[PDB]
Amino acid sequence: DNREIVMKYISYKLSQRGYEWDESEVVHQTLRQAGDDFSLRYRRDFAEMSSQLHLTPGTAYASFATVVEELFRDGVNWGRIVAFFEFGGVMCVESVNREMSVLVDNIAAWMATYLNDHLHTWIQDNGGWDAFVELYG
Template sequence: MAPVNRELVKFFLCHRLAQRDFPTSPLRLQDTRDRTVVEKEKASPTAGNGLQDRDGVIPPRHGDDDVEAVKLALVESADEFELLFTQAFNDLATQLQITPDTAYSSFKSVMDEVFKDGVNWGRIVGLFVFGGVLCLECSEKDMSELVPRIADWMTMYLDENINEWIESEGGGWASFAQIFGQDAAAKARKARTSMKRWFLFGAVVLTGVLFLVCYVKRR
């Protein structure tokens, strides 16, 4: 597991829930559970084999300022993404008709469709935005117990399908902060154009997913 992925997912979902005045306690409770599990694992013979990080506890590390810069860039880019395409995401969440039994398959099918032709930062931002929309949808429909599970699914998808690209081709999360962060606003127009191109490409993919969902549901 890449610990920073877990940290970013929880931060982003808490931020989105708080924006709409929904409780973030499901994620906070999960943090408490994770710490309890880790303490038990530290006391077991298997401690030291890396399992203590598997439940999402973030070990102390240097570079916290870099992580904070990534968080700020993630919120800013997600806000811009949502301003452009929020209706499409809301329509998609409604069409999926999320229930406890269908939530995971719905999440994974959408993500597989979004990333089937490759990975870029715009699509990764789309993953966070869609996860946030799902959490809001679940909270509105009294299914807040799904919120920590969505956080798990987002983290798992990032770790298993996206992290290799982030580290190798994407230049790491630090590169994301440089491209999408506040300091990037003063950079050359080319960087801004690239950002919009990534967002637009993500929207085209998302629209295709929405039409696919509508088509399947009507059959």
């Protein structure tokens, strides 16, 4: 349940920054492209967010949960789902940047849990990932 989409996304985001880590491919491609477009368009916002983010082992779980709860406070939509994935990427990149790479595995798990428990119903009820591909393809 959703581990693969998260794992392939985070692997890609980290690889884009020079770090090696470790349903169908059109979905993973579309998400990569959407995320990339989003981070390019909002490059300064993302750079400043990366900067200002507070991150340690003891605070990371609460930081992720709080951000993601606020992101979806008003409901789910695809643009917010893309931001979610991109924010998971930011946290993972910063984790590695700040010599806290042990957090990557945890962040990926939190992302998969959140998809499974909190985004799955909206995605299921709004045409699934195929709809995402139709919107962004």
